[PDB]
């Protein structure tokens, strides 16, 4: 199981310090480097740099060099990415991935981390309110009932939403977040199910907003 | 060394050959090794980048037989034959000849399928929200193609404006459809003044506007 696992989403103010982690397990850490890759909004990938654990050899992108710092702790089998003083412009998804350091072998990114949304803003964190989108006759047709949850008024991204602890997955539509005039995000997650089984099945959205320490399990009863 | 992919966007039908090209400003073929220092990547929504190819043509373990890596020197090519629905992604070529190992700009691959009209549903606001002081009416257009759909809110047949927000999904990996939600947000005070709350949807698949509505 070749697996890189990064830390969850982080929220900061401009000026503040931050270090994100990249926990590498299931392979020999000395055999590879660990790269860092910024996901550009809309479309793009900026290769930030690389770092090797045994040698401590850093190679950066000339634009990002000096602004950010890399480091590795060989005992934990972990790579890092520090910020001494964060700008508002630093906000984005940041991936990590392994690069193969053996003799006469290709330096390509075969296994990647899940990604971490670092967010830099003077705005206050706010947890969402989770309202049930209940299945009624105005969401039931053709033997198919539609139901969901409305995750309104939060900051920053992300809210992650599963259904029945990840067991219900086919037919789900977690929409992108809309930005309200207030500055706060709003978002809906829905699912289509059989209208016959609404009496024998319980549907619960698991709204999870890590910045405000908000886990919410909301049962969506019919009306 | 910089990489310019071509095209930026591309719509291809299910079963056709999709062609994505990558161009180096310099050159990533080292003459001594007889190897092109270059890779290809796929990047679906809600997942990290999956590696497709390395050394230009050599294929990663588990990657589909339909995918092909090709080209040399400056010019390279990704070739996806017999296009399946799951191939909906952003595609990136990347070099590792010298530092920085730059990726390309990105090539967005959209899937073209038959016209599917939306299944339109509406949700009145919850009693939990009405107690808190606001009222959000969600209209849900479910599983349609093509991407372009319009929604019009009508409170007692009177066209609303300035108080609704919508969002389209990414394209689906199984059935190639888009879904859309729209949220008419009102105060509880304003919401209680009016009876009929309707969501009029227009789409290519539909011959006329479909209205899904309810009485408060």
């Amino acid at each position: 199981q070749v697996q890189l696992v990064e830390s969850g989403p982080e929220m900061r103010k401009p000026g503040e310090s931050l270090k994100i982690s990249c926990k590498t397990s299931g392979y020999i850490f000395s055999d590879y480097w660990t790269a860092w890759v910024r996901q550009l909004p809309g479309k793009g990938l900026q290769w930030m740099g690389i770092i090797y654990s045994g040698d401590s050899d850093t190679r950066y992108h000339p634009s990002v060099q000096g602004h950010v710092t890399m480091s590795t702790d060989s005992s934990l089998t972990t790579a890092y990415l520090q910020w001494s003083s964060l700008k508002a412009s630093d906000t984005g998804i940041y991936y990590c991935a392994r690069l193969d350091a053996r003799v006469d072998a290709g330096w390509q990114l075969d296994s990647w981390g899940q990604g971490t949304l670092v967010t830099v803003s003077s705005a206050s964190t706010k947890g969402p309110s989770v309202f049930p989108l209940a299945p009624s006759s105005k969401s039931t047709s053709g033997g198919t009932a539609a139901l969901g949850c409305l995750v309104k008024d939060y900051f920053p991204e992300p809210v992650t939403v599963s259904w029945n602890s990840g067991a219900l997955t086919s037919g789900v539509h977690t929409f992108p977040a809309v930005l309200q005039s207030s500055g706060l995000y709003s978002l809906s997650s829905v699912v289509t199910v059989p209208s016959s089984s609404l009496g024998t099945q319980t549907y619960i959205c698991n709204v999870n907003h890590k910045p405000s320490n908000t886990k919410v399990d909301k049962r969506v009863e019919p009306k | 060394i910089q990489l310019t992919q071509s095209p930026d966007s591309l719509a291809v039908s299910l079963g056709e050959r999709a062609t994505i090209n990558c161009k180096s400003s310099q050159s990533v073929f080292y003459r001594d090794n007889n190897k092109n220092y270059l890779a290809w990547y796929q990047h679906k929504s809600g997942q990290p980048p999956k590696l497709l190819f390395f050394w230009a043509s050599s294929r990663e373990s588990g990657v589909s037989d339909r995918f092909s890596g090709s080209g040399s020197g400056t010019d390279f090519t990704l070739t996806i034959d017999n296009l399946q629905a799951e191939d909906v992604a952003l595609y990136y070529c990347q070099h590792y000849f010298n530092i920085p190992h730059n990726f390309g700009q990105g090539t967005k691959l959209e899937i073209k399928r038959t016209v599917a009209a939306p299944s339109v549903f509406i949700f009145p606001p919850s009693d939990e929200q009405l107690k808190s002081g606001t009222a959000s009416v969600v209209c849900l257009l479910n599983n349609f193609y093509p991407r372009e759909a319009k929604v019009q809110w009508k409170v007692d047949n009177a066209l609303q404006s300035g108080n609704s927000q919508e969002s389209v999904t990414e394209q689906d990996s199984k059935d190639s459809t888009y879904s859309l939600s729209s949220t008419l947000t009102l105060s509880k005070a304003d919401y209680e003044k009016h009876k009929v709350y309707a969501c009029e949807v227009t789409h290519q698949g539909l011959s006329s506007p479909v209205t899904k509505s309810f009485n408060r």
């Binding site: 053996r102 003799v103 006469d104 330096w107 | 080292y30 003459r31 010298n98 530092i99």
Partner: peptide
């Protein structure tokens, strides 16, 4: 133009 690739094979 550059002919030497920058080696990163630490072994």
């Amino acid at each position: 133009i550059v002919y030497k690739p920058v080696d990163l094979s630490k072994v």
